[PDB]
Amino acid sequence: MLYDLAKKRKTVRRFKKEKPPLEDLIYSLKVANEAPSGMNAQPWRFLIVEDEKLKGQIRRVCERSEKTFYENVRGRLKEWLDEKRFTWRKPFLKEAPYLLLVFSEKSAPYSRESVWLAVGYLLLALEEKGLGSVPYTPPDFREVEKLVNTPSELRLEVILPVGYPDDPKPKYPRNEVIVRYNTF
Template identity: 75%
Template sequence: MLYELAKRRKTVRKFKKEKPPIEDVLYSVKVANEAPSGMNAQPWHFLLIESPQKKKQIREVCEKAEKCFYEKVRGKLKEWLSEKNFSWRKPFLEEAPYLLLVFSQKGAPYSRESVWLAIGYLLLALEEKKLGSVPYTPPNLSEVAKLVNAPESLKLEVILPIGYPDDPKPKYPRNESNLKIDTF
């Protein structure tokens, strides 16, 4: 069953207007809380944003930095972004019913690794509830953290827009050559 969830889960940048029950988002956070962490520190912190005004502010701050980033990007990355029709515009930050900001506790052992394990759990739990997301890491995470008055002891790791998917594009194919396991 878990493998089926993982196979089905894809990145979603377009969302239906219908707002999912908050209980489904909270369930996903509870699943994330079960992730392993260094010294069992559980260094993750979650901030759920529903306010249209706050989502708009976050979008504006992120797009300002994204525009600068896109103007500087070159080479293979520029080609890939163009091929996938990505731009500095991030409407999903406003259109998703929820934004879940995930923070790590600065100074906790293996904080970043632990938080990203929790994010993996969370993404599969969202899929179980038929919700979509995209792990979005803007180039100015610290500015977004300041915008939401996050304590200095926390580092923003990712913004997860959450809602019912309305994104018709298929999941990118997986690289089957990564399935090789060497033994000694």
């Protein structure tokens, strides 16, 4: 049941040491690749980072940026992050066996929308394969882009650490859908 898959899927920010088989990641990318896209451009590109040194560099640049963000954040965002016990620390960037970086092709019509739609497919596929993920979005994408030698034609959309879930925290609530009809 698709609803069961979607309902059960939750953020995973803590992963086991063991590396899942690459085939499970590739399966999820093949699922995502079947998604629609503006002018069927398929504007998604994937980079799987496994190198330990590289993961550490990515972790460090992101944590540096997050530190500044956490020092400056306020209001509703600050309150939410505080209540959920978030901090600038992102150990999963080093500890996840894979970092799946998802890029969009700048030139494609509705490229960014299309890649995010495909990320929806991707996350469901990872859940199907029993893997965990978090759509991590650091304050500064450019530093991470440079670390992996991103071509100028591509834009990093999200970093998805992927691994076996390790006693993840509970899914947050979902308010019921409240639809409107015809007009507001």
